[PDB]
Amino acid sequence: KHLSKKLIYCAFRVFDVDNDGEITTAELAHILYNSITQKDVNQVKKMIQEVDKNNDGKIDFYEFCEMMK
Amino acid sequence: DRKHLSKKLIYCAFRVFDVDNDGEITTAELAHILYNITQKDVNQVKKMIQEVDKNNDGKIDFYEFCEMMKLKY
Ligand SMILES: [Ca+2]
Ligand SMILES: [Ca+2]
Ligand SMILES: [Ca+2]
Ligand SMILES: [Ca+2]
């Protein structure tokens, strides 16, 4: 389990582009779609809402783990 | 639907770890992601890969990466 934990940490760090400890809509859209559309942004917003435990519109590491485990 | 999203993020995570896009994470790629290596570090990585290598080739493919992310039923 430790190794999957370590890789979950690394994955978050790489998605958290600006290193503030939160994945935003803009960061998540960028990872999901490497010049993308409003429709895509709204779909990302809805995804975040399914796992956003503190309702701030972002995904922190705890929320990322909860979603992964 | 939240299963679907975790699945999408597991795909994206793999892709980013698989630096050269050949569909396999190798010792060198995993070491690179784990360490911002000495021989000791390389061997530590090789041991981690062993724990989850299912086809005994010393690399982690997406299927193995996914399996590792979930419980053994
Ligand atoms: Ca961030
Ligand atoms: Ca949040
Ligand atoms: Ca590779
Ligand atoms: Ca393998």
Side-chain angles (χ1 to χ4, degrees), chain A residues 2-4 6-30 32-44 47-68, chain B residues 2 4-32 34-35 38-71 73:
Chain A
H2 201 152
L3 170 64
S4 66
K6 193 166 308 271
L7 288 179
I8 281 162
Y9 187 87
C10 298
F12 183 75
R13 289 280 301 117
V14 169
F15 304 158
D16 175 15
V17 170
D18 66 3
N19 307 306
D20 69 340
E22 299 284 358
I23 299 162
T24 64
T25 302
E27 292 171 324
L28 187 55
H30 188 265
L32 295 171
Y33 310 123
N34 300 3
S35 204
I36 68 101
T37 68
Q38 179 66 48
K39 267 188 189 194
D40 301 328
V41 171
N42 302 329
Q43 180 176 356
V44 176
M47 290 164 158
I48 284 177
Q49 208 191 310
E50 298 175 277
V51 298
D52 186 10
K53 277 174 159 252
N54 64 2
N55 195 228
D56 61 0
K58 312 178 190 162
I59 299 179
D60 67 8
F61 176 66
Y62 166 72
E63 292 159 343
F64 187 76
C65 288
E66 286 292 295
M67 133 195 215
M68 294 310 229
Chain B
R2 177 178 179 150
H4 199 154
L5 171 64
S6 66
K7 234 91 227 274
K8 187 54 195 276
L9 285 181
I10 283 160
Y11 185 87
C12 299
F14 185 76
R15 287 280 302 118
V16 167
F17 303 153
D18 174 14
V19 167
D20 68 2
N21 308 308
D22 69 340
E24 297 283 359
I25 301 161
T26 64
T27 301
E29 293 169 327
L30 187 54
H32 185 75
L34 296 172
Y35 309 125
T38 60
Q39 175 76 64
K40 157 154 282 192
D41 304 322
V42 171
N43 291 326
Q44 278 173 356
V45 177
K46 277 172 175 191
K47 308 278 205 167
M48 290 164 167
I49 288 177
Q50 276 176 234
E51 299 167 28
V52 299
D53 189 4
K54 279 175 158 251
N55 64 358
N56 193 30
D57 64 1
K59 310 180 191 161
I60 303 178
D61 67 12
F62 178 64
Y63 167 72
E64 291 159 342
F65 187 81
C66 290
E67 288 291 297
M68 131 195 213
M69 295 306 156
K70 58 214 206 166
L71 298 181
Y73 281 116

